[PDB]
Ligand binder design. Structure first.
Ligand code: SF4
Ligand code: SF4
Ligand code: SF4
Lengths: 51, 314, 176, 43, 156, 110
């Protein structure tokens, strides 16, 4: 807050943003059909991931 | 008078697969707490007509066809192999009576993968080719286990003629002394038709992705014709009904009833299980189905000699 | 205050091992799933017959914007420009001038319905209850410019839906 | 005054624990039934 | 005459056939896609209208743009629309695909999906309710119902 | 000749269906699709397991054709020789399956 009635900076931290960051390590050694479940087990919603 | 019989065999096949689509739609709706199509007419009777006329006036997808002749030939071959294969079914008399009708159906079911191979070859995308190769490998392996199971079944019967199998199943059904073969045949009829929970033709890309909507509709009608064919084959060969030689329509009604409840069981099973993986069902046959099937074949080829129950050739 | 899910050690006796073998061979849990699907086949579906049946909604429902009137024929808005200042999407454009009798009234009240997010800040910031997020929701249009409302369309909406907006605000105003 | 309030006796108990029925026939008995069906069909 | 009456009958026949089996392509972008899935719930039940759920984009007849169409996604959406066979219809969910809505003045948001593809039915809301999209689909069916392809072909 | 009559009728009906699906919608004047897959530019990889399981299918189907004529053979006079031959052939199938199991055949495509 800068003192006025408007926010100076408002960062949104997404729980799914860091969860998708580990996806490269998540699917190491698994099959190509397992990424539809590895994406599934993390609650990944592309609204808060991309802001 | 023969061509009238051919027409009355081939037109109700198309009506039956259109109503397969309609009945499957409302059954999957009602299985999952929702409702099926009921707006177009009374209880959705006119929905398949709308489906057919919609799919017969749409634009194609316009693929970069490497081979135009192969692209034309694949759906013609698929519909031919689905439609001409219904002949030797004994309901209560076949249209054409062969001494080797089961071998006839087995051979054309084994060669039915040529449509999938040509569909993979007609599309220039390599991922479609990979999916086609995977589907072909699954189908040829599962045809191997079908061949062993059917070999056991007609060595129990003793004759390759399909009409004598009704006479064989007169006192008791074949499912009573061949129940483990029955369960393996039920998994094989669930699995050979590219169906869930082993449907890898939808999960991750189909084998006809670049094909037009007309050829896609032809492929779907062919697959559903194969579904009804092998459902009726299971009904006839594992659940043979009583057939009077003077009063045939009771047998026709009875095996129609068993075919309808077996198709309902198909729609039941397809709506209760999640999809497998490719290596999962490859492991299912190549390490779990094949040795048990071989042991069953050994037991059923050793049993009638030791039981003095070798069935007649004629 | 914490419970160990999936930390049940299976029994190693002959009874549980044989029962698990029977479950694996006879597909007993699959039979349970089949029975559950059969039981859920026979229930009455919850499908309401739209448009002959409508879903349950509340009097606080936020829908199509409308401009109300006093019970004397005069328009409620006084061109105070609170709704265009509070609008988070800036869909409201107001241009005003003192009219013939000297009353402070709007000359242009534009709501961009393609810009609006239906948040209801205008209906609560309005000190005279002029603009109301009305109850209408079946106003899908075939053309983009038909969703760009001027003052006349909003006033026609208010004259059309006042007979139910007045009842809704009468039933709701004690919560505000 | 008037506002949305729970009743003066409170609401009733609400179940929240896991509750699965658990049902079966024994494996030995099922295999005996399979053996009996096999021998009846063979006969 | 005979010809105008015959082509009128054939026109309404093919028009009923097209409007009774609208197979959609759902673009799962944002909030309005979740509202579409809740319109696919057993309560509202699109499937009784002849509208299947989650069809492939190579066989679909209509496309429902549900969500925000950013700059990074517009070529993909145009490619999908170009791949879908004729006749093709577009229904716009939400304020995002109508005119951008909340994000109309953002730097990386296309101000309306009309700038990329032709749009027939605009459904307003944020999100529009499930029955509102059902009414929009019925409005699209009525728009198809009054099409005059064969009459214009015979008159031309 | 009735069987070939049925085959010709069925093939011509399939030809009529594909002609309706291929040339009947050409009356419409919709558009021309210029149209300017995960496979970017790489060559198709030779996944050897698919070829291996295909030729394994071929060998198993060949000796299935060997195994076939038991229902006709069951009426023969020398039943002991038939029983020995059939049991030994199915044992050969089991032995080939065991070898294909052991030498890393059923791994990475189980
Ligand atoms: S509901 Fe909210 S976004 Fe819509 S006009 Fe009113 S203040 Fe603006
Ligand atoms: S807040 Fe109400 S009175 Fe003020 S300008 Fe808006 S509609 Fe008019
Ligand atoms: S219009 Fe509103 S509800 Fe729909 S996607 Fe945009 S922000 Fe979400």
């Amino acid at each position: 807050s800068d003192g006025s009635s408007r926010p100076y900076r408002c960062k949104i931290k997404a729980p799914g943003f860091a969860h998708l960051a580990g996806l490269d390590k998540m699917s190491k050694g698994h099959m190509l059909a397992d990424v539809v479940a590895i994406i599934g087990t993390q609650d990944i919603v592309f609204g808060e991931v991309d802001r | 008078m023969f061509m009238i019989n051919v027409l009355t065999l081939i037109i109700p096949i198309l009506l039956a697969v259109a109503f397969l689509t309609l009945v499957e739609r409302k059954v999957l709706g009602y299985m999952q707490f929702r409702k099926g199509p009921n707006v177009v007419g009374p209880y959705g009777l006119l929905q398949p007509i709308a489906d057919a006329i919609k799919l017969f006036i749409k634009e194609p997808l316009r693929p970069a066809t490497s081979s135009i002749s192969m692209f034309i030939l694949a759906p013609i071959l698929a519909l031919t192999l689905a439609l001409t294969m219904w002949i030797p079914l004994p309901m209560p008399y076949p249209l054409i009576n062969m001494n080797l009708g089961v071998l006839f159906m087995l051979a054309m079911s084994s060669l039915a993968v040529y449509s999938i191979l040509w569909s993979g070859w007609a599309s220039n995308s390599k991922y479609a080719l990979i999916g086609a190769l995977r589907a072909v490998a699954q189908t040829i392996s599962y045809e191997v286990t079908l061949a062993i199971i059917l070999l056991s079944v007609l060595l129990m019967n003793g004759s390759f003629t399909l009409s004598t199998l009704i006479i064989t199943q007169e006192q008791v059904w074949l499912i009573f002394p061949a129940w483990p073969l029955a369960m393996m045949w039920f998994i094989s009829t669930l699995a050979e038709t590219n169906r869930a929970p082993f449907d890898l033709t939808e999960g991750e890309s189909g084998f006809n992705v670049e094909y037009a909507a007309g050829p896609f509709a032809l492929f779907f009608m062919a697959e559903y014709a194969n579904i009804i064919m092998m459902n009726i084959f299971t009904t006839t060969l594992f659940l043979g009904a009583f057939h009077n030689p003077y009063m045939p329509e009771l047998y026709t009604i009875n095996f129609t009833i068993k075919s309808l409840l077996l198709s309902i069981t198909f729609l039941w099973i397809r709506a209760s299980y999640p999809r497998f993986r490719y290596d999962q069902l490859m492991h299912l046959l190549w390490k779990n189905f094949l040795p048990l099937t071989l042991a069953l074949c050994m037991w059923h080829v050793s049993l009638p000699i030791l039981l003095s129950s070798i069935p007649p050739q004629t | 205050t914490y419970k160990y899910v999936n930390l049940r050690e299976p029994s190693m006796d002959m009874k549980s091992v044989t029962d698990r073998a029977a479950q694996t061979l006879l597909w007993t849990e699959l039979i349970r799933g089949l029975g559950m699907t059969l039981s859920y086949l026979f229930r009455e579906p919850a499908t309401i017959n739209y448009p002959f049946e409508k879903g349950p909604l509340s009097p606080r429902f936020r829908g199509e914007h409308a401009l109300r009137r006093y019970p004397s024929g005069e328009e409620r808005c006084i061109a105070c420009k609170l709704c265009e200042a509070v609008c988070p999407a800036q869909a409201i454009t107001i241009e005003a001038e003192p009219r013939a009798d000297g009353s402070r009234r709007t000359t242009r009240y534009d709501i961009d319905m393609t810009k609006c997010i239906y948040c209801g800040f205008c209906q609560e910031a309005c000190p005279v209850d002029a603009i109301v997020e009305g109850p209408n929701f079946e106003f899908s249009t075939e053309t983009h410019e038909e969703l760009l409302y001027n003052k006349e369309k909003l006033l026609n909406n208010g004259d059309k839906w006042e007979a139910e907006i007045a009842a809704n605000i009468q039933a709701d105003y004690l919560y505000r | 005054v008037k506002q949305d309030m729970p009743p003066v006796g409170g609401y009733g108990p609400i179940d929240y624990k896991r509750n699965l029925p658990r049902r079966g026939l024994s494996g030995y008995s099922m295999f005996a039934v399979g053996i009996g069906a096999l021998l009846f069909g063979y006969w | 005459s005979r010809g105008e009456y015959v082509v009128a009958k054939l026109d309404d026949l093919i028009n009923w056939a097209r409007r009774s089996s609208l197979w959609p392509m759902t673009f799962g972008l944002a909030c309005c896609a979740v509202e579409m899935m809740h319109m696919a719930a057993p309560r509202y039940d699109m499937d009784r209208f002849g509208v299947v759920f989650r069809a492939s984009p190579r066989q679909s007849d209509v496309m429902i743009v549900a969500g925000t169409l950013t700059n990074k996604m517009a070529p993909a959406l145009r490619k999908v629309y170009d791949q879908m066979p004729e006749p093709r219809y577009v229904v716009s969910m939400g304020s995002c695909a109508n005119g951008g809505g909340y994000y109309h003045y953002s730097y990386s948001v296309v101000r309306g999906c009309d700038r990329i593809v032709p749009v027939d039915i605009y459904v307003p809301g944020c999100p529009p309710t499930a029955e509102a999209l059902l009414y929009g689909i019925l409005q699209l069916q009525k728009k198809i119902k009054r099409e005059k392809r064969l009459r214009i072909w015979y008159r031309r | 000749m009735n069987l070939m009559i049925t085959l010709l009728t069925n093939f011509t009906l399939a030809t009529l269906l594909v002609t309706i699906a291929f040339w009947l919608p050409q009356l419409n004047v919709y558009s021309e699709k210029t149209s300017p897959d995960p496979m970017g530019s790489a060559r198709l990889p030779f996944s050897m397991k698919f070829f291996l399981v295909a030729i394994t299918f071929l060998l198993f189907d060949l000796e299935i054709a060997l195994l076939l004529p038991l229902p006709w053979a069951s009426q023969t006079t020398n039943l002991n020789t038939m029983l020995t031959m059939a049991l030994l052939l199915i044992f050969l199938l089991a032995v080939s399956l065991a070898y294909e199991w052991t030498q890393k055949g059923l791994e990475w495509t189980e």
